[PDB]
Amino acid sequence: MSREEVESLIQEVLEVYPEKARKDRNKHLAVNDPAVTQSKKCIISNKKSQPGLMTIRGCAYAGSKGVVWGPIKDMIHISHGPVGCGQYSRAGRRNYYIGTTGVNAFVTMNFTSDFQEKDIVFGGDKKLAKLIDEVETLFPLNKGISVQSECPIGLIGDDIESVSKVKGAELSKTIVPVRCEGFRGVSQSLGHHIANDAVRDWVLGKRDEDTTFASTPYDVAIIGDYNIGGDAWSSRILLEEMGLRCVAQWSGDGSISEIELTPKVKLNLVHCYRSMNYISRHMEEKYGIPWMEYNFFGPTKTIESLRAIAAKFDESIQKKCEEVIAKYKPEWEAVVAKYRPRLEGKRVMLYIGGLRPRHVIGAYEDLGMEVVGTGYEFAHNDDYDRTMKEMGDSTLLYDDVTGYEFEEFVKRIKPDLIGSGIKEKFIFQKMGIPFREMHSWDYSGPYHGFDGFAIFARDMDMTLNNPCWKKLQAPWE
Amino acid sequence: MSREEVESLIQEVLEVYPEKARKDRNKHLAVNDPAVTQSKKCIISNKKSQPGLMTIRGCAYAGSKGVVWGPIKDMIHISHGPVGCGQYSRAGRRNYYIGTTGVNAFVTMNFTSDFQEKDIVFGGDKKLAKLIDEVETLFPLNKGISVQSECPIGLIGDDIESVSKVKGAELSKTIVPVRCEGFRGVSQSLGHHIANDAVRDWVLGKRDEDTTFASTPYDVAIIGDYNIGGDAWSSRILLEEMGLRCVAQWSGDGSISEIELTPKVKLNLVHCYRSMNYISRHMEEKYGIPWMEYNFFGPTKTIESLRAIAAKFDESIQKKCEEVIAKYKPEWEAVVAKYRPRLEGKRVMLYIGGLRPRHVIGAYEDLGMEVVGTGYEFAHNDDYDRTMKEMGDSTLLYDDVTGYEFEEFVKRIKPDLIGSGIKEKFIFQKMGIPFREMHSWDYSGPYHGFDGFAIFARDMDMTLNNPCWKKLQAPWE
Amino acid sequence: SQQVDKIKASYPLFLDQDYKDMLAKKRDGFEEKYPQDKIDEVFQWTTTKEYQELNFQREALTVNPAKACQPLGAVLCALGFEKTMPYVHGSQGCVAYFRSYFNRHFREPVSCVSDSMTEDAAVFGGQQNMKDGLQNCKATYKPDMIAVSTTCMAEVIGDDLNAFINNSKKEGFIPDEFPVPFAHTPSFVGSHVTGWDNMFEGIARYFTLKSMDDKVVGSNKKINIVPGFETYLGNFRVIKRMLSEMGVGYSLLSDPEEVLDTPADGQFRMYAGGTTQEEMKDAPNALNTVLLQPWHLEKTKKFVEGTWKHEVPKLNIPMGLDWTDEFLMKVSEISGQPIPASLTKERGRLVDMMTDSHTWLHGKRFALWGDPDFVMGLVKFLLELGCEPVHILCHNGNKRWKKAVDAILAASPYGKNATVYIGKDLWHLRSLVFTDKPDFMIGNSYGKFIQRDTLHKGKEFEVPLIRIGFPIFDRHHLHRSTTLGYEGAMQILTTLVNSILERLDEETRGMQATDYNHDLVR
Amino acid sequence: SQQVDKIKASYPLFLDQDYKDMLAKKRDGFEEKYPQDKIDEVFQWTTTKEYQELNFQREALTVNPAKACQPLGAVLCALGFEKTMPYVHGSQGCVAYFRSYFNRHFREPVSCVSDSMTEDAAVFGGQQNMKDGLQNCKATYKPDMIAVSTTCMAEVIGDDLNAFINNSKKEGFIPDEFPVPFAHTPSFVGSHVTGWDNMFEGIARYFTLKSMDDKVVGSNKKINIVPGFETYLGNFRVIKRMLSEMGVGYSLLSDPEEVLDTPADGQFRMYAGGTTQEEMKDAPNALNTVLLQPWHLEKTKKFVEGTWKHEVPKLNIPMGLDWTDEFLMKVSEISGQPIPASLTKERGRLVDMMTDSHTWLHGKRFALWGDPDFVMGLVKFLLELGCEPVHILCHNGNKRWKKAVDAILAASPYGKNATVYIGKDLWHLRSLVFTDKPDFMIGNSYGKFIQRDTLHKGKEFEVPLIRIGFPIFDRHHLHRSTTLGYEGAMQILTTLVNSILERLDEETRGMQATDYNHDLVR
Ligand SMILES: [Ca+2]
Ligand SMILES: [Ca+2]
Ligand SMILES: [Mg+2]
Ligand SMILES: [Mg+2]
Ligand SMILES: [Mg+2]
Ligand SMILES: [Mg+2]
Ligand SMILES: [Mg+2]
Numbered sequence A, B: 001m002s003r004e005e006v007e008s009l010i011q012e013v014l015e016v017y018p019e020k021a022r023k024d025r026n027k028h029l030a031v032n033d034p035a036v037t038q039s040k041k042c043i044i045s046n047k048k049s050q051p052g053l054m055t056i057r058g059c060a061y062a063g064s065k066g067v068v069w070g071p072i073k074d075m076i077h078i079s080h081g082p083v084g085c086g087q088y089s090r091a092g093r094r095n096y097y098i099g100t101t102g103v104n105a106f107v108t109m110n111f112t113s114d115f116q117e118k119d120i121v122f123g124g125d126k127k128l129a130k131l132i133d134e135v136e137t138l139f140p141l142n143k144g145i146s147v148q149s150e151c152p153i154g155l156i157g158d159d160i161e162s163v164s165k166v167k168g169a170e171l172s173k174t175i176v177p178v179r180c181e182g183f184r185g186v187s188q189s190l191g192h193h194i195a196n197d198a199v200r201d202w203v204l205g206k207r208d209e210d211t212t213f214a215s216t217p218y219d220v221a222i223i224g225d226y227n228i229g230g231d232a233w234s235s236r237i238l239l240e241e242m243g244l245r246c247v248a249q250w251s252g253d254g255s256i257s258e259i260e261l262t263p264k265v266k267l268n269l270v271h272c273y274r275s276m277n278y279i280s281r282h283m284e285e286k287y288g289i290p291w292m293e294y295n296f297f298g299p300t301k302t303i304e305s306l307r308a309i310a311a312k313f314d315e316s317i318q319k320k321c322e323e324v325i326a327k328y329k330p331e332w333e334a335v336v337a338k339y340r341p342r343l344e345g346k347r348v349m350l351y352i353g354g355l356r357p358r359h360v361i362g363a364y365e366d367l368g369m370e371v372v373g374t375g376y377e378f379a380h381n382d383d384y385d386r387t388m389k390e391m392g393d394s395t396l397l398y399d400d401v402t403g404y405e406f407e408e409f410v411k412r413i414k415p416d417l418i419g420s421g422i423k424e425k426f427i428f429q430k431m432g433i434p435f436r437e438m439h440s441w442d443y444s445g446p447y448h449g450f451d452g453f454a455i456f457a458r459d460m461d462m463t464l465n466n467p468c469w470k471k472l473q474a475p476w477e
Numbered sequence C, D: 001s002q003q004v005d006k007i008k009a010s011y012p013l014f015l016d017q018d019y020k021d022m023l024a025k026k027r028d029g030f031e032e033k034y035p036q037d038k039i040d041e042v043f044q045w046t047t048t049k050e051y052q053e054l055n056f057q058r059e060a061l062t063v064n065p066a067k068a069c070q071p072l073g074a075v076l077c078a079l080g081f082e083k084t085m086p087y088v089h090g091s092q093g094c095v096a097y098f099r100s101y102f103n104r105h106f107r108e109p110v111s112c113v114s115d116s117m118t119e120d121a122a123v124f125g126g127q128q129n130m131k132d133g134l135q136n137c138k139a140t141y142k143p144d145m146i147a148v149s150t151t152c153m154a155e156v157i158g159d160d161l162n163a164f165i166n167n168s169k170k171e172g173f174i175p176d177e178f179p180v181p182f183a184h185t186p187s188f189v190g191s192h193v194t195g196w197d198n199m200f201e202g203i204a205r206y207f208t209l210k211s212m213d214d215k216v217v218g219s220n221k222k223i224n225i226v227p228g229f230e231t232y233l234g235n236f237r238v239i240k241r242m243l244s245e246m247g248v249g250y251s252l253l254s255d256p257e258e259v260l261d262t263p264a265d266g267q268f269r270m271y272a273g274g275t276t277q278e279e280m281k282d283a284p285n286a287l288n289t290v291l292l293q294p295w296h297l298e299k300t301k302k303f304v305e306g307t308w309k310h311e312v313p314k315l316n317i318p319m320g321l322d323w324t325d326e327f328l329m330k331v332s333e334i335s336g337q338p339i340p341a342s343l344t345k346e347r348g349r350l351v352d353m354m355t356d357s358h359t360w361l362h363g364k365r366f367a368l369w370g371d372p373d374f375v376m377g378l379v380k381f382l383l384e385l386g387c388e389p390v391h392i393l394c395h396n397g398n399k400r401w402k403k404a405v406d407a408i409l410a411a412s413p414y415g416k417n418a419t420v421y422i423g424k425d426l427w428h429l430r431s432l433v434f435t436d437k438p439d440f441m442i443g444n445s446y447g448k449f450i451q452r453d454t455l456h457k458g459k460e461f462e463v464p465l466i467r468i469g470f471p472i473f474d475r476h477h478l479h480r481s482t483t484l485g486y487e488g489a490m491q492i493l494t495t496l497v498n499s500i501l502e503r504l505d506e507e508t509r510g511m512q513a514t515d516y517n518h519d520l521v522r
Helices: A003-014 A019-026 A060-069 A084-088 A117-122 A125-138 A152-156 A160-171 A188-204 A233-241 A256-260 A273-287 A298-310 A315-343 A361-365 A381-390 A403-413 A422-430 A449-464 B003-014 B019-026 B060-069 B084-088 B117-122 B125-138 B152-156 B160-171 B188-202 B233-241 B256-264 B273-287 B298-310 B315-343 B361-366 B381-390 B403-413 B422-430 B449-464 B467-471 C017-031 C036-045 C049-055 C070-079 C092-106 C127-141 C152-157 C161-170 C192-214 C233-245 C277-285 C298-308 C320-335 C341-361 C372-384 C399-410 C426-435 C447-457 C485-507 D017-031 D036-045 D049-056 D070-079 D092-106 D127-141 D152-157 D161-170 D192-214 D233-245 D277-285 D298-308 D320-335 D341-361 D372-384 D399-410 D426-435 D445-457 D485-507
Strands: A029-031 A076-080 A145-149 A175-178 A219-225 A245-251 A267-270 A291-293 A347-350 A370-376 A396-399 A417-420 A435-437 B029-031 B076-080 B145-149 B175-178 B219-225 B245-251 B267-270 B291-293 B347-350 B370-376 B396-399 B417-420 B435-437 C084-089 C145-150 C223-226 C250-252 C288-291 C365-369 C388-394 C419-422 C440-443 C465-467 D084-089 D145-150 D223-226 D250-252 D288-291 D365-369 D388-394 D419-422 D440-443 D465-467
Touching: A003 A019, A003 A029, A003 A396, A003 A403, A019 C127, A060 A076, A060 A084, A060 A145, A060 A175, A060 A188, A060 A273, A060 C092, A076 A125, A084 C070, A084 C092, A117 A152, A125 A145, A125 A160, A125 C049, A145 A160, A152 C152, A160 A175, A175 A188, A188 A256, A188 A273, A219 A233, A219 A273, A233 A245, A233 A298, A233 A315, A233 A449, A233 C017, A245 A256, A245 C017, A256 C017, A267 A273, A273 A291, A273 A381, A298 A315, A298 A361, A298 A449, A315 A449, A347 A403, A361 A370, A361 A449, A370 A381, A370 A403, A381 A396, A396 A403, A403 A422, A403 C127, A417 A422, A417 A449, A422 A435, A422 C092, A422 D341, A435 A449, A449 D341, B003 B019, B003 B029, B003 B396, B003 B403, B019 D127, B060 B076, B060 B084, B060 B145, B060 B175, B060 B188, B060 B273, B060 D092, B076 B125, B084 D092, B117 B152, B125 B145, B125 B160, B125 D049, B145 B160, B152 D152, B160 B175, B175 B188, B188 B273, B219 B233, B219 B256, B219 B273, B233 B245, B233 B298, B233 B315, B233 B449, B233 D017, B245 B256, B245 D017, B256 B273, B256 D017, B267 B273, B273 B291, B273 B381, B298 B315, B298 B361, B298 B449, B315 B449, B347 B403, B361 B370, B361 B449, B370 B381, B370 B403, B381 B396, B396 B403, B403 B422, B403 D127, B417 B422, B417 B449, B422 B435, B422 C341, B422 D092, B435 B449, B449 C341, B467 C341, B467 C372, C036 C447, C049 C426, C070 C084, C070 C092, C070 C145, C070 C192, C084 C092, C084 C127, C127 C145, C127 C161, C145 C152, C145 C161, C145 C192, C192 C277, C192 C298, C223 C233, C223 C320, C233 C250, C233 C341, C233 C485, C250 C277, C277 C298, C288 C298, C288 C320, C320 C341, C320 C372, C320 C485, C341 C485, C365 C372, C365 C426, C372 C388, C372 C399, C372 C485, C388 C399, C388 C426, C399 C419, C426 C447, C440 C447, C440 C485, C447 C465, C465 C485, D036 D445, D049 D426, D070 D084, D070 D092, D070 D145, D070 D192, D084 D092, D084 D127, D127 D145, D127 D161, D145 D152, D145 D161, D145 D192, D192 D277, D192 D298, D223 D233, D223 D320, D233 D250, D233 D341, D233 D485, D250 D277, D277 D298, D288 D298, D288 D320, D320 D341, D320 D372, D320 D485, D341 D485, D365 D372, D365 D426, D372 D388, D372 D399, D372 D485, D388 D399, D388 D426, D399 D419, D419 D426, D426 D445, D440 D445, D440 D485, D445 D465, D465 D485
Parallel strands: A076 A145, A145 A175, A219 A245, A219 A267, A267 A291, A347 A370, A347 A417, A370 A396, A417 A435, B076 B145, B145 B175, B219 B245, B219 B267, B267 B291, B347 B370, B347 B417, B370 B396, B417 B435, C084 C145, C223 C250, C223 C288, C365 C388, C365 C440, C388 C419, C440 C465, D084 D145, D223 D250, D223 D288, D365 D388, D365 D440, D388 D419, D440 D465
Antiparallel strands: A029 A396, B029 B396
């Protein structure tokens, strides 16, 4: 499709809406233009969703409990409020970890204060204090507690900071109050910010003047990798093969001690910019730790990232960098040789959260595929600046896409593959369009690093080339 | 029911038949009378089945391959003829064993010469010789081969004795030809006799000149226990606790070496009289080994059997006998206390093969049950003599019962429980009569010995008292 | 590393030596992990009677609940109406979770909107959200009906749904005649099943309260059927199939079986099938109304008795033999239709299957959980099979329900070792399956973590999960199954007996050790 | 010893130390057993390529066959006719085995008589047995038809069934008009499926050959359906359901679904349902005749084409998506009935399931066996699912069949690593699953011994069995399942994907070892 055909498509789709929604949604849809690099000249982002239009977004509690805090493995995270939020989010996200669940690790469990109407009437602070003691009795190897506020907490005027301070001092225990009520902000995005500030305020400073830990020149932290299907582990291996020492993973497979040690590192390696740029900036401000954005999707980006990271160190790491790249060269070359011919020329539309809608484009390109549309639930304009340089000329960009819009764009553009979420998957499959979940990896992965690229390629191929897609039309119709 | 009523029931049932079948079946049905001990005055047995009346009987191959030879664990048994007989009989009978199947033991396997029309026309002897070599190559730890003849072998004039002699000498191997073709005899019974004669002729004399066996005064063999669900193991345990040494088990869990060592024992202990009296009499005549009938069904019979067996030995065995009885007393007393109240006064009809139709009566009586009818597929008059002694006055006796007769007797007598085979089970369940398989033990057991009695009692209880039986009548009819 | 012709996902990739060594060094370097012997010590303690006693003294902490919140049930109820959009007034985070939760169970699209209330509504309320939301939803998704429920922020703020919806119509955001039934669905009261009852009663009242003057009980010669919260497609299908076979006129009120099973034929269908608005308007004219799941339809029942004047029969859920019989006999009485030959035969086929399988089922011990009606019907059928339901847990149960289940248990010898738990969670159940080990669990996918825990103690302590309930996320297409009627009973019996025999095969598969009992025939 | 409140059956009774010690003493004392090191050495050798090469050189020995003999099939065919007694001329031992084999599969009564020929008949033949047998059978069991087949002794001695039956009527043992169709069924030719074809064609001839002169093709407006040897009840039922749904007039010729599924209501029914004599007599008036299992109905086909003059369509068994489509399109053409909305929607629900499950099915490797039509349909559907049917064994298959299967494999990329084996047995198959290990087996209960063997080499080598075929003796009520049509495809897909996920759960259940991949959602 030409730029004019795409712009016309936008206007046709918007015809359905009442005037106020139409005027709003027009601002959140754009056609990429190489002459225009400032996204604040072509798209609005990180605003409220329009009522009744079937946004795909979640809330601040998802962003804090589900995304940042939940993966920390040796803490207990309380879903504080009524029973729904913690139940729907229990083990939905594949933030992988090593531990003994219910004993020293708690990730896939759902701890809650199960608010009843009496807790709305009288407040939940007394219940929270009691709940903390019961946690301590029944889960003695927990290394800390977080309190992930659901909608009612702030609305009824509870004081979870006071309970956290008092019980923390009573028990010599790290107890973190998190005001991630889903009424706050407009999406998961503000939850990340709230969560980062909670780490800052209640955890990160704990070892500030503690210099027990023996540092080396090669100490780094992986910031903003939640280890989906083992993504952080297939990243870590490469960084350590290159001669670096990965002191911390924020927060996939993350322990509270490794978070507390992070102020000792020499360099913060930021994968997910959206969710963890806040604490990265904090650590630079306060501890003088530089940070840098990288990308471990596909061989092209992975190689570029390893070289850029190694350049921050000395000749010994730069040498090990080249050793790593030579080791894996035959492996990813064999993946390309097998799968690129089976995928080349095929067109993809993506819709994901805050990073992957731009970050995975290189990996598609490494298999000869073309990303013809992309967009985000909750990204900001700094994300869209980055996106416009990774995406092709005249491609479709969509912020906080509505159900209706996504469906209608797909029917016109007719992509060969869609990469999006669980609420999207079954819709597109029925239309006869190969779909891959690009949050959960469709229960596959890892997709990060060289070992991840093989799995990514296998997966795009098994789905795009599957025999089921030739069978949707009955031969008598 | 009175004697007069049972006699009238017989006459009423037999009205359906054509004259010839009527006159024949009348001879095979009787009402037990304490004045008449000689079964040759009240019932005919071990005759041909009348055509077309749905006998429950099998054939001589079932009696030889299925019953006697098949359980011998470290020999390979060839089902020699077309594919059916070996396939239907593969692992149908639960003659339990310890071994490594396909390597040193072969019981649940189906070895066959799978006769094609070419084998009918040219004969199977060359195929059999080739088959033996293939067996030696692929199953090198086999300790002997038997050749179990199916219907066509004798009809086409093959000479399996000649092949067995020649290949046996060539390979230094025991190869046993068994002429158990299903056209021979009238039932499983003649297969037993043929099988016993083959053991006699081809296996049992191997060690006649050998004096290396370290004998003891307490050596015995268990003759005619096929270890259904482990029956022979829960018998052996008691004999050895009583201070005896069980040199051999014929043939449940039996090895070829144990059979070869049996001429060295002091006493043969015969459980199944019907199938194994032949070889027992042979061993008395040739080796001077005495034999005695016993019964390990229920505590009354088990205790009487242990005492009768101990009385053949010295004071040391008699003393251990009493120690065994005292050890198990509280165990079977607890079974009686639990289950006798749940079963007492309930009436049973049995129909089984050659032993159990009389042998299990004492175990039913130990739980307060009454056996009101019994009968056998293939028993002889010496079996019926023993039966009339066990069975109550005026009870119904049936030899080679027809499907029609068994149904109609059950409809009139209305027993609380039926104990019979797989071809009978589903008929009587549809009639709303609790049924227990008394060949396979309905995949339960053991039933022999004190440990077997607990299981028997559990089993009669779970079926007779089951909630399903109250539900056959729809509440709207 | 990867070998291209045999690519490894996470399992078993991370078992390669280089990954194992890397994870060991991460642990030892940076995780400050408790020593393994201490972890083993605490694990063993969590399996004890002592720990169970502490666990059962909890008052404030809930761990691994076996319930969800009201609006999820309101959404499921609303999906069962023709061309109806479920619409939850309040926070959009909730609707992402409701959709995803049902998406994972049915493997289907789940359509639902939010009106995206934010922090600003705490000053001024959610009225403008309702006006714009209804207008936008109607225009964009072209529903014929919008069925409104609430999230917990709308409830705490105290938005008046009735006034908001009336004002939306008055000010022209939607046409006056456009149907917008509503129910308040506070997550802090009851559970997801209460949300279902609330939503249903709201839709019933919308279409019937004002128009009762012309109604005559029995004048349409049909029986209304209300299914409640129901997540097996086969359950809706079997009820309609049985009534049709009987020649009984009926109306199934809330029927999502089409919208939760659209064909993959090249088009997406946002709406399919469903109860019509005309069926709800005409429902007071029925002979009577039968509630399939009465222990969560109390509010519906009061409306049906108080306004429609239907003599709602006292029937248990039609699960197992006796309760299916009772349901068919009551339908026969109301309708004057005899139970047909076809159902009498089906019944006797179920009984045949019970006689055939009773020896393997007898005395088997089960732990189980779920919603109240489902749990009580499973208990009843287990007693009919000669099984012992020793741990019966209903997190969202109440005292009157527990008494009812305790009476059923007391009427059978198979109930002697059984205890019914209410308000207890799967961390409570975990203790019980350690301290009083049953043969199997019957439950939803959250049971898998209990099976994992039991195996960790040892193979001989493992309690295998049999998946019946909601949600089932880790197996495919089990939502197509049936648990009601004779068909459902046949399916449950088959699943249980075959689970028993699978496990026995496992325990007897050991060459020259346990395979003496590896029978070909069972 | 036993403890009365927890009685132990064989497993786990014989694991008690006293029994273990007793069994060691028996072995050491008297069994002269090969040393365990030698047993281990030989076992390991039986898993090798070297052993496989010797195994596949066998010419005379057969081990663990995957077929049975003709008369079994004749019996199953005969059971499908109204008030019909199967009768096997020859030896009674055969009839005890046929009855028992089917009893164990269906868990039902199976009625069949013998005429009890003995050794004496090798002098004089079985004519008197036939005379008394027919008279006795007719009086005693009151069938409306006796369908006669033979055992191998009757075939070898050369008894002429036709003459014997004729003489039985001539001499007054049965009425002249009483129907006694017959077929020769030699066990040393073909297999059980051959017996089915022979019996069916014998019955078809009986009712039609002499009365052809008043017949007109198409005059009754129906399609005849011949199912072949079929041991799933769901398979008779689904074909009848789909044709009824389509408004197609049909006659199912040989229909045992009622007599293999009688209710347990207090009476035993020796006979139930079945194809009527009137249906067989009128069959030449049908539009055409469709064979569901053509690769074992060649004799039947020749009769229908040669005598009825029906142009039997070239259709594969209706298994999987393409072949069910083809069946329905051909039935539409013959009958003039369109394919209705209900079937089109069912088809699209199967496709939906395929799209939902394709990621777990993709590339999975299977070994499988069974009868030829069943096997080729399973292969076709596996290819449609993106699975690799790498070991395809049909003991009773032939070269022409193998060529057809090889053609289906060549047309799909998923057939590239597949081999079709004919005349090979489950001892051959055992070698293949060691040397070229697949993920699963799909087959009958005899497969359980191969799974046992594979686990003995080690857990990582175990190939789990998925039970589809005949006989299934060690699970209950699987005979109620369906494998034909869209319904059968849905059942097969669900079984395979859930077998895959069950094994993945097992391999990821290890705490702090593999449970990083023990996902709640799959
Ligand atoms: Ca789906
Ligand atoms: Ca049955
Ligand atoms: Mg969780
Ligand atoms: Mg490289
Ligand atoms: Mg048998
Ligand atoms: Mg068991
Ligand atoms: Mg034990």
